[PDB]
Structures are given as C-alpha cells and as structure tokens.
From a paper:
Rspo (R-spondin, also roof plate-specific spondin) proteins are evolutionarily conserved from fish to humans and have well-documented roles in a broad range of developmental and physiological processes resulting from enhancement of canonical and non-canonical Wnt signalling. ZNRF3/RNF43 specifically targets these Wnt receptors for ubiquitination and turnover, hence reducing Wnt signalling responses. Direct extracellular interaction with Rspo proteins inhibits ZNRF3/RNF43 activity. Here we report a molecular level analysis of the ZNRF3/RNF43 ectodomain structure and its interactions with Rspo proteins.
Sequence analyses suggest a putative domain structure for the Rspo proteins comprising two furin-like cysteine-rich regions (Fu domains) plus a thrombospondin type 1 repeat domain3. We therefore engineered constructs to express the region spanning the two Fu domains of Rspo2 proteins from several species. In the crystal structure of the isolated RspoFu1–Fu2 protein the two Fu domains arrange sequentially to form a ladder-like structure of β-hairpins. Each Fu domain comprises three β-hairpins rigidified by four disulphide bridges, similar to the cysteine-rich regions found in members of the epidermal growth factor receptor family. The connection between the Fu domains shows considerable rotational freedom, allowing a 50°–60° variation in the relative interdomain orientation. The N terminal of the two domains, Fu1, is distinguished by the extension of the second β-hairpin. This prominent loop presents a solvent exposed methionine (M68) at its tip, which we term the ‘Met-finger’.
Residue numbers in the entry: 39 to 142
Amino acid sequence: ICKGCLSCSKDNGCLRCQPKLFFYLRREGMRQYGECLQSCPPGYYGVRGPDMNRCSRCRIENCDSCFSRDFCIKCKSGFYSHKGQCFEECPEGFAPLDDTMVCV
C-alpha cells in the first residue's frame, strides 16, 4: 500500500522511507503523496539526509546531472562547466582546456 516505507499515511502516503531508498514527493489530489524510490527520476538528484535520502529537482542550466543544488557533475554534452554551472563560452576572465570543457 505504501512501498518501502517505515511510516505510511492513508492520505499523504509514505512519510518515512526504508533506509536504502529515496523519498520522492508528488501530487495525489491537491495533496502531496510521497513515494520511496530505488534511484531518483530524471532531472532529479540524490540527497543523503541524516533521517532519509530524498530526490530533488536539478535546477542548473544545461546540466545533464546535478550533484548538489549548485553543483553539476555533468554538463550537457558540448558545454563548459565553470563554478558549478554549465556555460556556452567561458566568461570574461577564463577559457577552456586541452579538450576538457572547463573554464579557467
């Protein structure tokens, strides 16, 4: 009924996931239902909490895959990571490397 849960609520769904899974929120009714996932969806990154791990929307431009809120571990194929972000051309002060895609 709630899957991979440790406390399950008729209406808001799972409120505490089993240690290995990722809490994911979504709409059921106007309410927010909570799930417990194997890994996160797409556009979502893992977040190791002290109580529980949870999924969170990646909000970096041109980022294939976040690592934290402000830090992209993978920029869109063909894009220059710099200071967490992913950029078209390196900004004033910086330039790429010997085939890295990283501003200096």
